[PDB]
Amino acid sequence: MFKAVLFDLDGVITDTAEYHFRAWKALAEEIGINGVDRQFNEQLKGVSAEDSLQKILDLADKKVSAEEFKELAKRKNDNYVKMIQDVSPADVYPGILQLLKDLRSNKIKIALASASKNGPFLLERMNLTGYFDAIADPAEVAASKPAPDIFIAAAHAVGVAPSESIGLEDSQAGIQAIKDSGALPIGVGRPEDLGDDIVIVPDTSHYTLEFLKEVWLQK
Ligand SMILES: O=P(O)(O)OC[C@H]1O[C@@H](O)[C@H](O)[C@@H](O)[C@@H]1O
Ligand code: ALF
Numbered sequence: 001m002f003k004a005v006l007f008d009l010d011g012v013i014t015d016t017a018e019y020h021f022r023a024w025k026a027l028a029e030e031i032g033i034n035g036v037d038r039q040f041n042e043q044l045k046g047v048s049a050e051d052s053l054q055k056i057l058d059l060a061d062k063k064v065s066a067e068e069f070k071e072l073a074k075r076k077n078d079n080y081v082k083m084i085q086d087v088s089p090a091d092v093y094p095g096i097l098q099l100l101k102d103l104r105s106n107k108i109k110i111a112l113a114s115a116s117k118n119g120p121f122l123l124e125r126m127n128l129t130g131y132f133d134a135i136a137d138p139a140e141v142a143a144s145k146p147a148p149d150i151f152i153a154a155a156h157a158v159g160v161a162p163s164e165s166i167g168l169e170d171s172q173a174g175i176q177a178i179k180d181s182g183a184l185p186i187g188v189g190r191p192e193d194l195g196d197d198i199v200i201v202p203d204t205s206h207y208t209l210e211f212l213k214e215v216w217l218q219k
């Protein structure tokens, strides 16, 4: 049996992937870049703020100064942070609170494997902090998603090997990070976006302890 579950936050615990998208799209358009649509945004999910802005700039082969880059990242974060102030426990995605309670009851470790510097604040907004045994610090890893480091760190923070863990993700980059960590990925979203080579559920209500156990059993 698996010993830990390693959670992505945005798009897994709550619908904040939508808010990252809207904030990055708005930023892109302010600097005259119009290609940040939902399809392109599949390349932005899971990656750090710095990598997100770089991918957007790359889209238009645009070059900005280092000072401008810092200011643009800050502007997007400030906007995003305002957007999320009213997040509450009502915003936790279906099934997720039950899953956390069921994992806890069965002595399965719970760790956050989020790239987001806003992760601790969002878990507080949603009254979820008490369920997490550890939160991996995304500033402390040497390499961000799709590098596996954050998933490895999250497993190690709860005293479990990645190979004894399940990772839950909504992004291409995150799925790759889970694969390379040694943990077992279960994605949420569309196979058109996330692939046909791992288990994908259509919505978070499918993330039940019973389903996770069966996935684990089947390999
Ligand atoms: O800008 P933050 O809050 O540090 O978030 C970093 C990343 O966190 C990930 O969880 C999101 O999927 C990305 O979209 C986001 O860029
Ligand atoms: F959506 Al995440 F780390 F919370 F990639």
Ligand SMILES: [Mg+2]
Residues within 6 Å of the ligand: 008, 009, 010, 011, 012, 017, 045, 046, 169, 170, 171, 174
């Ligand atoms: Mg995500």
Ligand code: NA
Residues within 6 Å of the ligand: 124, 125, 126, 127
């Ligand atoms: Na709270």
Ligand code: NA
Residues within 6 Å of the ligand: 129, 130, 131, 132, 133, 134
């Ligand atoms: Na906690």
